[PDB]
Structure 1
Amino acid sequence: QGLPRVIELFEARRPKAKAVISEIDGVVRIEETEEKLSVFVESEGFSKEYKLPKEARLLVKDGDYVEAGQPLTRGAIDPHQLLEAKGPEAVERYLVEEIQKV
């Protein structure tokens, strides 16, 4: 994506084709009707229902364990959501590596 991707990173914009990340650690449970599609990240005392469009490529198959801040869909991560999910060091790592890819 070239120079626009770099600008999008240095400006910390929320990208348009944004991946969906998990807000908590937990276990995946896909719930796929032929009309709608959702992913649950469930833990001992928390349930996280992420309703996403039916055409989203998942990085996560049913039953996997995910860290808080791990991507479930494909695409670019919103840096502010990553910061809230996972903290400063992870956002630095992601910004540096994503800029260097280009």
Structure 2
Amino acid sequence: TGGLPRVQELFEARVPRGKAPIADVTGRVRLEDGERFYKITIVPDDGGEEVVYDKISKRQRLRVFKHEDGSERVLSDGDHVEVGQQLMEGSADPHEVLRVQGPREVQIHLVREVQEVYRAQGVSIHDKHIEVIVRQMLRRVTIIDSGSTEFLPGSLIDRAEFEAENRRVVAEGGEPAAGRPVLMGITKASLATDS
């Protein structure tokens, strides 16, 4: 997509249409071409299990990336890629780059992708205006296990309250609760305020 639908799908943090898979583990790519489905097992460079993306239809071209050769290289069996790299052409999924590459790469991705749409048609907005809105999209934590912290495992709570409770409980009884960062839209974040 492009234009206003692209801006909407970027700000509401939903799964894109033309989703492009990203590399899970840094390694050596083993591109086993199929009939109508590219199959690549990307051999790990440490010894881990083969992460395989399957059922990848032939609806789009491959990714033109740059390697040690210093030239625009198409994805062929023999190349080598690092963590967090699109394999085929399209747009990646923010919820996956989040976990793969930490919280900073998500904000980089979002600001860059929002600015490309506005810069294509020649509109100048400072980056400090999109950072204010991206800052509010990453403010909550999802509990995995609560232990004895008075939390329901699976809810969405603020980072400040989460760390305050985790510091209070360990200082007296002793139990750290679990939580991983999450990304929300602008409609689910507004309906979950404290008023």
- Deviation string, structure 1 residues 46-98 (Cα, Å, up to 9, x no partner): 21111111344222222222222210011111000111111111111110000
Range 67-76 or range 47-56, more displaced: 47-56
Q: Is the counterpart of residue 17 in structure 1 residue 18 in structure 2? A: yes
Match of 1:32 in 2: 33
Q: Quick check: which has more Rg, 1 or 2?
A: 2
Match of 2:114 in 1: 99
How many angstroms apart in 2 are the aligned matches of 1:87 and 1:66?
18
Q: Is the counterpart of residue 48 in structure 1 residue 44 in structure 2? A: no
Equivalent residue for 2:62, pick from 34, 58, 63: 58
Q: Structure with the greater relative contact order (CA < 8 A, sep ≥ 6): 1 or 2?
A: 1
How many angstroms apart in 1 are the aligned matches of 2:79 and 2:49?
16
Equivalent residue for 2:102, pick from 67, 78, 87: 87
Q: Is the CA contact (8 Å cut-off) linking 2:36 and 2:57 kept in structure 1?
A: no
Describe the SS at the equivalent of 1:22.
coil
Match of 2:158 in 1: none
- Segments of 5+ residues of structure 2 without an aligned counterpart are 64-74, 118-195
Describe the SS at the equivalent of 2:42.
strand
Describe the SS at the equivalent of 1:17.
coil
Describe the SS at the equivalent of 2:30.
strand
Range 32-41 or range 79-88, more displaced: 32-41
How well do the aligned residues superpose, as a CA RMSD in angstroms?
1.5
How many angstroms apart in 2 are the aligned matches of 1:35 and 1:7?
32
Q: Is the CA contact (8 Å cut-off) linking 1:24 and 1:85 kept in structure 2?
A: no
- Segments of 5+ residues of structure 1 without an aligned counterpart are none
Q: Is the CA contact (8 Å cut-off) linking 2:29 and 2:78 kept in structure 1?
A: yes
How many angstroms apart in 1 are the aligned matches of 2:14 and 2:37?
29
Give every structure 1 segment of 4 or more consecutive aligned residues whose post-TM-superposition deviation is greater than 4 Å: none
| Change over 3 Å in CA distance of 1:37–1:99 after alignment to 2 | same
Deviation at 1:35, TM superposition (A): 4.8
How many angstroms apart in 1 are the aligned matches of 2:6 and 2:36?
33
